[PDB]
Each structure stands twice: as C-alpha cells, then as structure tokens.
C-alpha cells in the first residue's frame, strides 16, 4: 500500500546527524517508490508546464545531507514548490537516500514537486559513476534495474509561466519547436546523439559562436547568440540549466539570458564550490539562495 | 510577465568565476 509518511519520516530522522548516516529502507518500499512515481511521470507531460512561485535546484549527485539543507533554507514540501533539474545520483555517498526522498515527495505532492531527467538518470552512465555500485552493495541488481525503468520515464524539460525554459543540459541544433519534445515517447533510454541527448548533455560556451564540439565527447556547445535566437523565437526570458559545476553555485551567461544552477557544494570531495537554489516569485522575479559547504 | 532579478543578485558572467564539467 506504500506507507509514504513512514518512509519520509525515516528519511528525515537523520536530519541533523553525523553526515554520512545511512537510511536503509526496505527493498519493497523503494520499489513502491519507483513504481508509483513512474505512474505519475507517465501521467504528466514530458514537457512540463509549471507556474511560479517555486524554487529550482541543480545537480545533487547523492549529497543527501546537502539536499536536506536546501529544504531547510527553502522550506520542506509542501511549504514551497520545487523543480529539480536532474543528476540526483552518482558521485556522492548517498544516491539512494537522495533519490528516495525526492521520489517520495513526488508521490506525496504530485502537483507541487517536479523532477527533470539529468544525464546521470541513465543506466549506461550510473552503472559506472556510482549508483549501480551503491545498489549492489546495499540492495541488489534487480533494484537498480527497477530504478532504470523509473528513470526512463522522467520528464525532459519544463517551461515556467511560458517564459522560463528549463532542462538539465541545454539547447539542441535539432530543437526547432517544443513539439519535438512533446513527441518523445516514454519509457526511453537516452540516445548517444540527437535532441534528447543534447537536452541532457549540451553546455553553453563563451568562446563558441554557433555550435561547437563538446569537451565531454557527447553532444554540442552553444554560444550566446544561439541563446538569443532561441529565446526570441519562442518568446522566452531565460534558460535555466544545470549539468555544470560553477564556483558560486550559479553562473549567468549571455547577459543573464541563461543561468546555470549547481546545488552540490564541494562537488566530488573537490572544487570548493558552493551550491545555489533559485527562488522565483509569482511576478517572475528571481533570486538566489547560496548553500556554502559544511 | 517578465523575468526580473532582485537588487542583491550579482551578475557574474564576466567576473572570472571557475567552472568545470567532469570531476
Ligand atoms: Zn549533468
Ligand atoms: Zn551532474
């Protein structure tokens, strides 16, 4: 039947504890989270149409205790609406607790809480970068495959009040109309090339004019004038993206026409970066809240 | 509506902030 409130309560019990303390749900509880959230994802559009006010977060990458701190600053649900831009698993020590809390909040408040797909919500990536190993050690392989079946149904992009375009990676040279996003059928894997790939993998680059090759070996880079023509063609004010670690937790691009959000401080036990969360009120007036390392 | 920014938000596009991709 899925005791959501008991799951959420145990996930929050370690709030304020020796950072790194595990929450070991049962296998059936986690599978219930995956099966229920998967239903909700498929029942909602692959291109979300959201409305302010809300708070937007970037990569978490298994830093569960930093995620709990974000909620302390911005208000635990349902006090605030939330949109996460992807990359919940891999790299960090506690991907499981991270993704379970987010899925539980998705099930609990399916209209005030939203999760986008990042490039790490993909079996071929998170098999390698930590999530699979965490599943093997703490549960079993079959649970990882259940997570994959859920990740394959995550929405890809969101538009907030018809003026803010949100995705994990960035723009595609194959993105002519938002209909190409709505057309993608779920469940799906992330292809090695094309629109869905670029939406999860591409980066902005100040030294590129049109489209350049991406250092990652996947997808493309895009320049400041690609942003302008996109925003103008689709009557938008801002592109909100993640996917890239940034010193301040946020970083503007192309005269504040694009912003990069990263929410995991001291990423990979390195960098000494900070994390940021972007608050949007109902007027579409936007601000940043900074999460410094701890 | 229109996206505007609060008076305390700093524009850091040209301030030489560090960025990175993989670890
Ligand atoms: Zn990413
Ligand atoms: Zn990432």
Numbering used by the authors:
A (entry chain C): 6 to 299
B (entry chain D): 39 to 61
Text taken from the publication that reported this structure:
Protein Phosphatase 1 (PP1; 37.5 kDa) is the most widely expressed and abundant serine/threonine phosphatase. All phosphoprotein phosphatases (PPPs), including PP1, require two metal ions at their active site (M1 and M2), which activate a water molecule to hydrolyze the phosphate group from substrates. In addition to a canonical RVxF motif, which is shared by nearly all PP1 regulators and inhibitors, and a non-canonical SILK motif, I3 also binds PP1 via multiple basic residues that bind directly in the PP1 acidic substrate binding groove, an interaction that provides a blueprint for how substrates bind this groove for dephosphorylation.
As anticipated from the NMR data, the interaction between I3 and PP1 is extensive, burying ~3500 Å2 of solvent accessible surface area, with strong electron density observed for I3 residues 27–31 and 38–62. While the I3 RVxF motif (40KVEW43) binds in the PP1 RVxF binding pocket as expected, the remainder of the interactions were previously unknown. First, I3 residues 27SLTIK31 bind the PP1 SILK binding pocket, but do so using a non-canonical SILK SLiM sequence. The next I3 residues, 54GRRSS58, bind the PP1 acidic substrate binding groove (acidic patch 1) with Arg55I3 and Arg56I3 forming electrostatic interactions with Glu252PP1, Asp253PP1, Glu275PP1 and Glu256PP1. The next residue with strong sidechain electron density is Lys59I3, which binds a deep, acidic pocket on PP1 (Asp208PP1, Asp210PP1, Asn219PP1, Asp220PP1). Thus, while I3 residues 54GRR56, especially the charged sidechains, are dynamic, Lys59I3 is well-ordered and tightly associated with PP1. No electron density for I3 was observed beyond I3 residue Cys62.
